[PDB]
Amino acid sequence: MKHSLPDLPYDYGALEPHINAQIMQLHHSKHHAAYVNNLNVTEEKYQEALAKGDVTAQIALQPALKFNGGGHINHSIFWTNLSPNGGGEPKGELLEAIKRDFGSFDKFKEKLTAASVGVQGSGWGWLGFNKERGHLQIAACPNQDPLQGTTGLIPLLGIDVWEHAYYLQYKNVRPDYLKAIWNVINWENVTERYMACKK
Amino acid sequence: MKHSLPDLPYDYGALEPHINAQIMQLHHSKHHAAYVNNLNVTEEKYQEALAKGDVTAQIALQPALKFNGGGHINHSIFWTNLSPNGGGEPKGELLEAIKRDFGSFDKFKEKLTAASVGVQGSGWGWLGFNKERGHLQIAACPNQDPLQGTTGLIPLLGIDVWEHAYYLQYKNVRPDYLKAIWNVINWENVTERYMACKK
Amino acid sequence: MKHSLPDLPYDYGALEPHINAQIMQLHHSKHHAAYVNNLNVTEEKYQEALAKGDVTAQIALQPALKFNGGGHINHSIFWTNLSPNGGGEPKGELLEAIKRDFGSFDKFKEKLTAASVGVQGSGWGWLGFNKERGHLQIAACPNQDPLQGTTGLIPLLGIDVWEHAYYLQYKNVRPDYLKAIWNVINWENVTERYMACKK
Amino acid sequence: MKHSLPDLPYDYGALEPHINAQIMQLHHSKHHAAYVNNLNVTEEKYQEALAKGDVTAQIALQPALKFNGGGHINHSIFWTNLSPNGGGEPKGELLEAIKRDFGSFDKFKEKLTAASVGVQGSGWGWLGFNKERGHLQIAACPNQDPLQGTTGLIPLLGIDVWEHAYYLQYKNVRPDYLKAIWNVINWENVTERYMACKK
Ligand SMILES: [Mn+3]
Ligand SMILES: [Mn+3]
Ligand SMILES: [Mn+3]
Ligand SMILES: [Mn+3]
């Protein structure tokens, strides 16, 4: 099927000083590229195993498929969630949905930050949409487990809290990284994902 | 491209009184049949997701593939591991490998029984072969997770400790079920699986 | 400092024909009794490890504590969730909360049944209360993992889908067990647990 | 009981150029210190919960206890596994045990490197001793899960492959970090741990 490393919609240094250029260059051109390359290799092996009816080979390939496939999914959403145009607060029905489900935008900020900072090891903090219940929901995913594939929630905004996402600039202080990322959140993209959920 | 429910190599009541006919009939004609049918349904869904490059659908289908695919793998080995002619002790290279790696046949029995009984919830106890290290190994698998697909060990002898495998006859006393199953272990089949590792 | 096996609030045969007396007698007098006894044994071992500062022993004891501690918690709620007088529909604020969060009582029944039946292996289906969001929530727990300890939800109604809870009467047909248990649900007790959240 | 951050047996820059001083200072004075502080807080909460017979609170505290307790255990072993005196090959019975169980020292190096590099997300690569089987064994542990508490193996040599252990110096190239760490392995300490296993 071939999965490809998507181009960035902005310069590597466009998010400075909140996220420096060296992190962006390494995160995109090294980490994400590795996920896409290993995903294509894994998908080809699974097609061969599925054709043979080799159930053992299919099951043995599941960790690599979820890890590299999730890494591709999560990082491709992550780039669209950020923008040099970003920051501030959302508007329209997204802001009102945040008000109804979390109380206020400031309360939503506190809960997503707490879930992000609270991740033990590598993982992701997500703002998702619960199509069954019809409200917003915050969830944390370990390693590269993708939100929709594992929980059914529709991903709206993701925060990478892998150490490679901040350590070069913020060292061990994960909260400092979380506080700075709010300044480059592309709320236009987050609203477009939310409206796609709505009828 | 079908996986099929294998026929039993013996009558449903051939293992009495150690395992009664109603358990054997239900385990084969109901439980195993459900695993194979759901495995075929799941495999077709995965082929559609794989053809479209839908990574989210591939990851969402992994629990059903592992559960039903493992259930088919585990139970098809299980039927060949039993025989009305079985019981006693193995001979040839199998017995010497057991003594070399476990000390004695009786201690091997105790170690596999302890791992079986120790399963919290549903699972399987396995005697496996480590091709890398070239010795025997005992492992426990949760639910329907298959041995080779999840651990790399080659399955030689498996003990189903799902409650459906003994509850109708032995109720909550799992050790009573474990003591009786040694009387119908098909050491001929276990020897052939062990020799398949050797070359 | 003992945890004790609670007495049943009804006769072992009081739930017939929906759940027969032999299942109730075995589930309470054998399964639950084993959980409480092993919980007390495990709690004493942890006190010794905790007093010595043995972190390795504390971590090694975690599976036994969660399994037997959860087994005690889950089953003691389970007995109070059932009654020979039960069945029908709840009234008061409970019914309005169910309609508000699920649409209707019948759809809530379908959603809890689907989560129950969908458990791969041993586990529990739960109706819980999310104190943070202030609405009802359905969750599934594996093995004996308790609802509040692992998810933070307050347990209101639990459905045991371990095979020992139905196999003697309904064999492999889990949906048949689910359909009959609605006839003895103690909505009075579920209402009291729900009101305990309210204040 | 109080757990304390152990002093380093060497200068922060004593492992240069293989591991630079800034990584060592951050790894010890920030990461490990956080594990010890959170472990003491968690241990105090568990003592209160155990005294009350609060099983739910005990189970809710298990992730924090394993994560911070394991972080303390793993890092306290890690510092003793490294030395400016280190590098080269082991001698005596340790080297012969490596020869018998892995074929050669070079083959052991390849297998431990592969397990380290193969960790998906945060984790550890371990050389352990299997007291039951009486041979050496390589295992990988996720996040801060300690070796002995989770697997029963006695830890001899540990390799931290959390991104905070190498990213400042080696960026995304985990193999470059693994190749350099062999030059500072304290084989004297590893042999002392191995002989403590022997009668
Ligand atoms: Mn990343
Ligand atoms: Mn079975
Ligand atoms: Mn039960
Ligand atoms: Mn570390």
mmCIF file of N, CA, C and O and ligand atoms in Angstrom, chain A residues 27 31 35 75 124 144 160 162 164-165, ligand 1:
data_model
loop_
_atom_site.group_PDB
_atom_site.id
_atom_site.type_symbol
_atom_site.label_atom_id
_atom_site.label_comp_id
_atom_site.label_asym_id
_atom_site.label_seq_id
_atom_site.Cartn_x
_atom_site.Cartn_y
_atom_site.Cartn_z
ATOM 1 N N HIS A 27 12.798 15.051 15.258
ATOM 2 C CA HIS A 27 11.508 14.392 15.446
ATOM 3 C C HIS A 27 10.894 13.986 14.113
ATOM 4 O O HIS A 27 10.324 12.895 13.989
ATOM 5 N N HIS A 31 12.838 10.313 13.748
ATOM 6 C CA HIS A 31 11.905 9.466 14.485
ATOM 7 C C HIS A 31 10.723 9.048 13.616
ATOM 8 O O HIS A 31 10.432 7.855 13.477
ATOM 9 N N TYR A 35 9.484 5.281 11.805
ATOM 10 C CA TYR A 35 8.189 4.629 11.980
ATOM 11 C C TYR A 35 7.582 4.246 10.638
ATOM 12 O O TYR A 35 7.036 3.146 10.486
ATOM 13 N N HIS A 75 2.182 10.773 14.859
ATOM 14 C CA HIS A 75 3.045 11.882 14.472
ATOM 15 C C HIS A 75 2.480 12.648 13.283
ATOM 16 O O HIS A 75 2.725 13.852 13.152
ATOM 17 N N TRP A 124 1.399 9.416 25.092
ATOM 18 C CA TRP A 124 0.732 10.556 24.483
ATOM 19 C C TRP A 124 -0.442 10.985 25.349
ATOM 20 O O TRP A 124 -1.110 10.156 25.970
ATOM 21 N N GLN A 144 3.405 4.129 21.502
ATOM 22 C CA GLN A 144 2.846 4.631 20.251
ATOM 23 C C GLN A 144 1.451 4.080 19.975
ATOM 24 O O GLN A 144 0.987 4.133 18.832
ATOM 25 N N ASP A 160 2.739 14.875 22.362
ATOM 26 C CA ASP A 160 3.792 13.872 22.455
ATOM 27 C C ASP A 160 4.609 14.123 23.717
ATOM 28 O O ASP A 160 5.231 15.181 23.857
ATOM 29 N N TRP A 162 6.824 11.604 24.767
ATOM 30 C CA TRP A 162 8.094 10.906 24.650
ATOM 31 C C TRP A 162 9.228 11.869 24.977
ATOM 32 O O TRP A 162 9.160 13.065 24.677
ATOM 33 N N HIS A 164 12.052 12.187 23.656
ATOM 34 C CA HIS A 164 12.653 12.783 22.468
ATOM 35 C C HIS A 164 11.917 14.033 22.000
ATOM 36 O O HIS A 164 12.461 14.779 21.178
ATOM 37 N N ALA A 165 10.708 14.282 22.498
ATOM 38 C CA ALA A 165 9.931 15.437 22.075
ATOM 39 C C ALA A 165 10.296 16.717 22.815
ATOM 40 O O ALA A 165 9.827 17.788 22.417
HETATM 41 MN MN MN E 1 7.528 11.508 18.973
#
